[PDB]
Amino acid sequence: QYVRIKNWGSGEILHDTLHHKATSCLGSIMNPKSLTRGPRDKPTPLEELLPHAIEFINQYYGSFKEAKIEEHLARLEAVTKEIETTGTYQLTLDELIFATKMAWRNAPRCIGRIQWSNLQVFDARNCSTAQEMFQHICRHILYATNNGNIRSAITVFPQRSDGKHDFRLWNSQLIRYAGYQMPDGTIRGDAATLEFTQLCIDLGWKPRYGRFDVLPLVLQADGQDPEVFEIPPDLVLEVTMEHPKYEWFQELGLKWYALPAVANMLLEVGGLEFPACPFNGWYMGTEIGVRDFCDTQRYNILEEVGRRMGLETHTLASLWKDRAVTEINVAVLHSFQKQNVTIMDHHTASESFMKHMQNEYRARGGCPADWIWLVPPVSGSITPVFHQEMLNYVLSPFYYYQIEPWKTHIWQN
């Protein structure tokens, strides 16, 4: 049958049948095992790889408007033989392109999925060295950035073979700031990247002890020890934070990178695994203004901006935190828009996702969604998405989390 889903805002009902294809209640758990695809030391068993491969080949060929059975049956034949003769198989570029968009399409934590069909794919499956990973990463950052007119892209490195030759990016994001535990008890920069910053120092990276120090790319190639590479500052576009009214906002000396790029996820498709496949899209205002700037475990600027606004920062009931965070979000949006850097505010994003959800239900009878992540960190019920009942499930292709590399890596030297 199906599962009835209701939108309490519009009163609309949808019928979810897509969940039938997935694979006590841990609700708000950030990194659950169900969303994580770990390491291996031995190749994927053939009895598992084959049915998974076949299923993907059928999905891929079954995605065209006008079916191409001749080519479909031929691919099934060749794939089976390649697995038989080599122990694994290589996807064609079109299958990879299809796989990367589908995985994005299947990302339950992404509110920007209406753009799923627009994705640039850089094939780095022939990559061999750390230096080469680095060159691809630079080409990626440069293409995606496009001088502010952000373009969604993904770079695919070699697939996992036996699990002892994994290509991995130790960074959580391509571009991110360093976090320092200054002497005076106060953390400087981005407190989220504290443990990682130290790791970069252990590998010889030169600390510049600032609030916005762009960290280096830490690349692991073919299972070998990671190599440190600084990102050419020319490639890192940034936005100066300016409020369109409180001229004292600049006096805060705030800024943020224009490129949100995930660096540590794993792409699973047709039984294959890609431990390294960095991808980016464009920012949604609240990520920066609310999470990056106001989380107490991040920049924690909230009170400083409060005091500055001349608000009762000692009486919670005054709703000062509410007033401040809104101006910061206004600052962020204002700044990006002025400096011509692509950005989407949370209200527009939500409406866009609601539209995407409607489309997906008619198109394939469902849309895997994680309410907890899809609802903006501010203006909850003020957004459409808040009133939309959702079903969270893992399909395939899919983007999985991975165990942090420093926790499983065997240091050669």
Ligand X SMILES: C[C@H](O)[C@H](O)[C@H]1CNc2nc(N)[nH]c(=O)c2N1
* Residues taking part in catalysis: 110, 113, 282, 287
Residues 317 and 43: their CA atoms lie apart, in Å, by 58
Taking the least distance from each CB to its own copies, the nearer of 1 and 412 is 1
Residues 40 and 351: their CA atoms lie apart, in Å, by 41
Using Cβ positions, the residue closest to ligand AS3 within the complex turns out to be 260
Tokens 């005091």, residue located? 307
Residues 207 and 101: their CA atoms lie apart, in Å, by 37
Pair type for strands 3-6 and 13-16: antiparallel
371 is in an annotated binding site: no
Among 370, 397, 398, 405, binds its own copies (CB under 8 A): 370
Closest CB 111 distance from ligand AS3, rounded Å: 8
Residues 411 and 178: their CA atoms lie apart, in Å, by 24
Q: Is 11 in the site for its own copies (CB under 8 A)?
A: yes
Sign of the CA dihedral running 364, 356, 93, 398: negative
Count other C-beta atoms under 10 Å from residue 337's C-beta. Answer: 14
Taking the least distance from each CB to ligand X, the nearer of 109 and 139 is 109
* DSSP helix/strand/coil, 42: coil
Residues 82 and 299: their CA atoms lie apart, in Å, by 51
Q: Under the rule (CB under 6 A), what is the footprint of ligand HEM?
A: 104, 107, 109-112, 115, 119, 152, 154, 262, 279, 281-282, 284, 287, 344, 399
Residues 257 and 238: their CA atoms lie apart, in Å, by 4
Tokens 């936005």, residue located? 239
Answer with the entry of its own copies, ligand HEM, ligand AS3, none that 197 interacts with (C-beta below 5 to 8 A by kind).
none
Among 119, 262, 266, 330, binds ligand AS3 (CB under 6 A): 262
282 is in an annotated binding site: yes
Among 143, 246, 386, 400, binds ligand X (CB under 6 A): 386
Q: Is 326 in the site for its own copies (CB under 8 A)?
A: yes
The three-point CA angle 24-26-28 to 5° equals: 140
In 106-164 the beta strands, taken as DSSP E runs, fall at 120-123, 153-156
Residues 384 and 286: their CA atoms lie apart, in Å, by 16
Taking the least distance from each CB to ligand X, the nearer of 142 and 372 is 372
Breaks in the chain, after residue numbers (C to N greater than 2.5 Å)? 23
Q: Is 310 in the site for its own copies (CB under 8 A)?
A: no
CB under 6 A: which stretch of 6-14, 89-97, 159-167, 273-281 binds ligand AS3?
A: 273-281
DSSP 168-193: EE-SSBSS-B-EEE-TTS-EEE-GGG
Tokens 């608000």, residue located? 311
Pair type for strands 153-156 and 120-123: parallel
Q: Is 8 in the site for ligand X (CB under 6 A)?
A: yes
173 is in an annotated binding site: yes
Closest CB 284 distance from ligand X, rounded Å: 9
Taking the least distance from each CB to its own copies, the nearer of 120 and 339 is 339
Closest CB 345 distance from its own copies, rounded Å: 5
Answer with the entry of ligand X, ligand HEM, ligand AS3, none that 115 interacts with (C-beta below 5 to 8 A by kind).
ligand HEM
Q: Which residues bind ligand X (CB under 6 A)?
A: 8, 28, 30, 372-373, 386-387, 389
* Binding site as annotated, residues for Zn(2+): 25
Q: Which residues bind its own copies (CB under 8 A)?
A: 3, 6, 8-11, 19, 22, 24-30, 290-291, 294-297, 302, 316-317, 319, 321-323, 325-326, 329-330, 333, 337, 345, 347-348, 351, 370-372, 375-382, 386-393
